[PDB]
Amino acid sequence: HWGYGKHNGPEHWHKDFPIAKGERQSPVDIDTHTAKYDPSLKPLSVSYDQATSLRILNNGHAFNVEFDDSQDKAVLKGGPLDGTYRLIQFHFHWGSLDGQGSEHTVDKKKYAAELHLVHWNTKYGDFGKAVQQPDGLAVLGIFLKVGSAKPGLQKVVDVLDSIKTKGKSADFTNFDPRGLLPESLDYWTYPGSLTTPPLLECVTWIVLKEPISVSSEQVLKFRKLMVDNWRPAQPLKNRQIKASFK
């Protein structure tokens, strides 16, 4: 019965998922002066040109745009990663007003929303096998700030009315996730977890420094589905956040 409310929200999750109090939980606050520049980190390779979106699902906690991951189409490689990770889905976290919504924070600053592009390591059989492994997933995190509209988000926003109800899905083919990426691929990276139950510690996080801008109208349409589906920042503990820059 986990969710984001007073009675079932993040502070309760540890009861059903004790790893919630574990050693590599996400999200975290990215303290830009404690983040360590690592010259050995390679540039990120985001290869999304042959992405095949299939559908969009309201899973009760967010909406997921799902991709065909049955062969290498949209993949993430390079950066802190060893090998190739296939895009399986993306989703967002957002708030009930503009001053909150992101999961990661940067020097304690919260953005209005955060996009997670979820990828699994093709050394493993499928996503299900990958989440059982400490290097199973790579999640590309992108902050959303409110200002100008992101044109490449409009197709997502426009279909949401058709999946207002929990559990419903819709066909969602031929969406190009390249339209959700900022100019720069400068990033921070650290080992962490899924930010929703079961909170498995299987993720290499790659959080981009440059946010994308979305319009007030765009985020307001997210909110017609639910609000405040973000887990707050968890302690960094015995980890270091590394930066691809400065």
User: Distance between CA 22 and CA 52 in Å, rounded?
Assistant: 35
Asked if residue 116 binds Zn ion (CB under 5 A), the reply is yes
Reference 152, options 178, 189, 190, 132; nearest CA is 178
User: Which span sits near Zn ion by CB under 5 A: 6-14, 80-88, 154-162, 189-197?
Assistant: 189-197
Asked if residue 104 binds Zn ion (CB under 5 A), the reply is no
Burial of 47 (0-12, 13-18, 19+ CB in 10 A): middle
Which residue's CB comes closest to Zn ion?
116
The secondary structure element, H or E, covering residue 219 is helix 216-222
Asked if residue 119 binds Zn ion (CB under 5 A), the reply is no
CB of 142 to Zn ion, least distance (A): 11
User: Which span sits near Zn ion by CB under 5 A: 71-79, 128-136, 176-184, 188-196?
Assistant: 188-196
Contact 26, 234 (CB under 8 A): yes
Collapsing DSSP to helix, strand or coil, 155 comes out as helix
User: Distance between CA 233 and CA 104 in Å, rounded?
Assistant: 6
Residue 61 annotated as catalytic: yes
Site string for Zn ion, 33-72 (x = CB under 5 A): ----------------------------------------
**Active-site residue set:** 61
Detail the residues annotated as belonging to a binding site for substrate: 195-196
Residues that bind Zn ion (CB under 5 A): 116, 195
